[PDB]
RNA sequence: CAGCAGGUCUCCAAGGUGAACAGCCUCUGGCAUGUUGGAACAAUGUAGGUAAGGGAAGUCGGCAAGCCGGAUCCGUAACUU
RNA sequence: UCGCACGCCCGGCGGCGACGACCCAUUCGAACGUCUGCCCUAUCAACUUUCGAUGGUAGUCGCCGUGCCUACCAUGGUGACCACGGGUGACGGGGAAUCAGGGUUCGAUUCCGGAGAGGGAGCCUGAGAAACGGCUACCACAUCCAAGGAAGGCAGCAGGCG
RNA sequence: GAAACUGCGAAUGGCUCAUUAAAUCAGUUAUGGUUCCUUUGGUCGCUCGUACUUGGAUAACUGUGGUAAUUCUAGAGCUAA
């Protein structure tokens, strides 16, 4: 089922082995009016480095991006198209700085496309140094 | 070769050059520290019992 | 007169006997024959090889 | 003052020796020995510390195709030292000198045999190590 | 010209090692070492080997001898039909 | 631990400091991080990956977070929105010159930040160095020498040679 | 009060741009992921178990010098933090 790594898998708050006669679970809010999601809670997963269920908070940036791969486990590749304007040739320009965030599978229905707002955090790996805060709908296809 | 002797109970010092190897037999091969009977040493140097130390070579 | 310690065996050497060795970067080496002498050249601890005294040395053997 | 007191000598014409200077050679094409007056189909030989006649095969090209007097340092084969002790330095080696005695280098790699600083006495003072 | 190391068309093919009906050892089967034996181990020989250091300087000529060599994983140039 | 005036009771009580200290804050910072901005090249189109390249688990080091490093899981990550590679008489910026405007060229040069003392490699002390008018080796250079050995780094100040 | 033992600085400064093409560097940011010499604001009888000051080693100095050569070094007599 679970715990399917090499080590005891759980969250360093939290403590059962205390004398007996549903597992207990520690999270946090995230702060800059963000919700915490229902699953998160809900769910039996452990993950440090998601900012609701791990030891890893969000400061300094706030971005956005639309995810274009998830071909990894446990976390996406984003896509960010921004426009710079050129001063000397009055045009703009089509520039893209793709990067890996860390997607927490505390959300489950995931798509491309979808539009994902991203929070700057300490180094986690050698370049990704952000989490999935939360995740929007994509522009319709409910189905 | 010189023989730098001292004498740790008076605190005095002399220098003595000795030109025989046969004079100098009882003292070769000693290490640090090392109680050598240096009653060959002379006709006047009777019980006396020394410790080396070494101290330079033919270069400095 | 300098009888001296076998580098690979540990056998005193006489000074009629023996073989000098010296590798490029600078030291010198002692071998008692060339049953020694072969032994060195082919990469063999003497630590390994039983008749040495550096075995009796550290396996604690006679004395 | 200083005599030969002849060695063991294994080196003829024809053997390559490393260069263990700082002249940029890399080996030295033995071509004949000076001083050897020589004997039929006899080649001649050279051991440590003799003159010899070189020439470098690979290496710096303002040395090579050109003839070359050197000074054999080391030797592979073991030889009789007087007081009875038998010498090999595992390669063969030889300095780039002139006809007085003067390095065309300034440094040495490894060591340089005693017989060999004696009867050279310049090629001595840039030795690191002696025997 | 012979009880001549020559030549002469075919059937069957054990076990092990090993890719193999290759080379080597063994079983069934066959034999006394191939027109004789004994005693020593001289030179020169024929057939095998080994050599410190150099590595073709030998020789018309790398002749002979010597090096590599099986398998697995990489890697593999110029040229070209 | 040390130095300077000096007092209160009938041997006991007190002053002004310096210095260094266990720890929490200040300052100068330092390093790790985010986003954005760089010259040319297709006669560089596919690049990288068990010789960590991309993430996870668990560890080591570290001042801590991290494939910085280690064993196992997935073969991924990037590129025609120009990746990788190569060259750059490329340290960069604030800025300087010419200019209607739009720019172009230069920017090593007194300010800031980075690097370095011939070259890399390694290091004690010291808060702070992988220092170099500090060390340990090698390479290239190179000084004295009695031949046994010792000793050096002006892309600093002036100055000498090429 | 020479010199010496002991602390701090010598990691500051001056020179140059060899190296370096999202790397340095320039603008907004965070250490909620760490240190910090010196300076300043504070705790510095908070602990429950010879003090009217403990111990023994050294440099300077006296003396031997070794060397061709150095900001090279030791033996004997000490003494202070």
Same mark, same amino acid.
């Given at each position: 089922?679970?715990?399917?790594?090499?080590?005891?898998? =759980?969250?360093?708050?939290?403590?059962?082995?205390? =004398?007996?006669?549903?597992?207990?679970?520690?999270?946090?809010?995230?702060?800059?009016? +963000?919700?915490?999601?229902?699953?998160?809670?809900?769910?039996?997963?452990?993950?440090?480095?998601?900012? +609701?269920?791990?030891?890893?908070?969000?400061?300094?940036?706030?971005?956005?991006?639309?995810?274009?791969?998830?071909?990894?486990?446990?976390?996406?590749?984003?896509?960010?198209?921004?426009?710079?304007?050129?001063? =000397?040739?009055?045009? +703009?320009?089509?520039?893209?700085?793709?990067?890996?965030?860390?997607?927490?599978?505390?959300?489950?229905?995931?798509?491309?496309?979808?539009?994902?707002?991203?929070?700057?955090?300490?180094?986690?790996?050698?370049?990704?140094? +952000?989490?999935?805060?939360?995740?929007?709908?994509?522009?319709?296809?409910?189905? | 070769?010189?023989?730098?002797?001292?004498?740790?109970?008076? &605190?005095?010092?002399?220098?003595?050059?000795?030109?025989?190897?046969?004079?100098?037999?009882?003292?070769?091969?000693?290490?640090?520290?090392?109680?050598?009977?240096?009653?060959?040493?002379?006709?006047?140097?009777?019980?006396?019992?020394?410790?080396?130390? &070494? &101290?330079?070579?033919?270069?400095? | 007169?300098?009888?001296?310690?076998?580098?690979?065996?540990?056998?005193?050497?006489?000074?009629?006997?023996?073989?000098?060795?010296?590798?490029?970067?600078?030291?010198?080496?002692?071998?008692?024959?060339?049953?020694?002498?072969?032994?060195?050249?082919?990469?063999?601890?003497?630590?390994?090889?039983?008749?040495?005294?550096?075995?009796?040395?550290?396996?604690?053997?006679?004395? | 003052?200083?005599? @030969? *007191?002849?060695? !063991?000598?294994?080196?003829?014409?024809?053997?390559?020796?490393?260069?263990?200077?700082?002249?940029?050679? @890399?080996?030295?094409?033995?071509?004949?020995?000076? #001083?050897?007056?020589?004997?039929?189909?006899?080649?001649?030989?050279?051991?440590?510390?003799?003159?010899?006649?070189?020439?470098?095969?690979?290496?710096?090209?303002?040395?090579?195709? @050109?003839?070359?007097?050197?000074?054999?340092?080391?030797?592979?084969? !073991?030889?009789?030292?007087?007081? #009875?002790? *038998?010498?090999? *330095?595992?390669?063969?080696? #030889?300095? %780039?000198?002139?006809? @007085?005695?003067?390095?065309?280098?300034?440094?040495?790699?490894?060591?340089?045999?005693?017989?060999?600083?004696?009867?050279?006495?310049?090629?001595?003072?840039?030795?690191?190590? %002696?025997?």
């Amino acid at each position: 089922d679970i715990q399917t790594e090499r080590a005891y898998q =759980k969250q360093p708050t939290i403590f059962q082995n205390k =004398k007996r006669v549903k597992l207990p679970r520690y999270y946090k809010n995230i702060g800059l009016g +963000f919700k915490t999601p229902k699953e998160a809670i809900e769910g039996t997963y452990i993950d440090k480095k998601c900012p +609701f269920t791990g030891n890893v908070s969000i400061r300094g940036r706030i971005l956005s991006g639309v995810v274009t791969k998830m071909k990894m486990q446990r976390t996406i590749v984003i896509r960010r198209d921004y426009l710079h304007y050129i001063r =000397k040739y009055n045009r +703009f320009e089509k520039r893209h700085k793709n990067m890996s965030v860390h997607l927490s599978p505390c959300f489950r229905d995931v798509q491309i496309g979808d539009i994902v707002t991203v929070g700057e955090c300490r180094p986690l790996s050698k370049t990704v140094r +952000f989490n999935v805060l939360k995740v929007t709908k994509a522009a319709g296809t409910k189905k | 070769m010189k023989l730098n002797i001292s004498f740790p109970a008076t &605190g005095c010092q002399k220098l003595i050059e000795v030109d025989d190897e046969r004079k100098l037999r009882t003292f070769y091969e000693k290490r640090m520290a090392t109680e050598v009977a240096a009653d060959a040493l002379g006709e006047e140097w009777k019980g006396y019992v020394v410790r080396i130390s &070494g &101290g330079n070579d033919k270069q400095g | 007169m300098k009888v001296e310690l076998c580098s690979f065996s540990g056998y005193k050497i006489y000074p009629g006997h023996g073989r000098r060795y010296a590798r490029t970067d600078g030291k010198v080496f002692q071998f008692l024959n060339a049953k020694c002498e072969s032994a060195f050249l082919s990469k063999r601890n003497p630590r390994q090889i039983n008749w040495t005294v550096l075995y009796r040395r550290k396996h604690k053997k006679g004395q | 003052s200083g005599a @030969k *007191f002849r060695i !063991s000598l294994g080196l003829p014409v024809g053997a390559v020796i490393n260069c263990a200077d700082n002249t940029g050679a @890399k080996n030295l094409y033995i071509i004949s020995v000076k #001083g050897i007056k020589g004997r039929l189909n006899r080649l001649p030989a050279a051991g440590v510390g003799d003159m010899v006649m070189a020439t470098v095969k690979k290496g710096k090209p303002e040395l090579r195709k @050109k003839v070359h007097p050197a000074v054999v340092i080391r030797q592979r084969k !073991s030889y009789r030292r007087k007081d #009875g002790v *038998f010498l090999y *330095f595992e390669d063969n080696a #030889g300095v %780039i000198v002139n006809n @007085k005695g003067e390095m065309k280098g300034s440094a040495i790699t490894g060591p340089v045999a005693k017989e060999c600083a004696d009867l050279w006495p310049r090629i001595a003072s840039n030795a690191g190590s %002696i025997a």
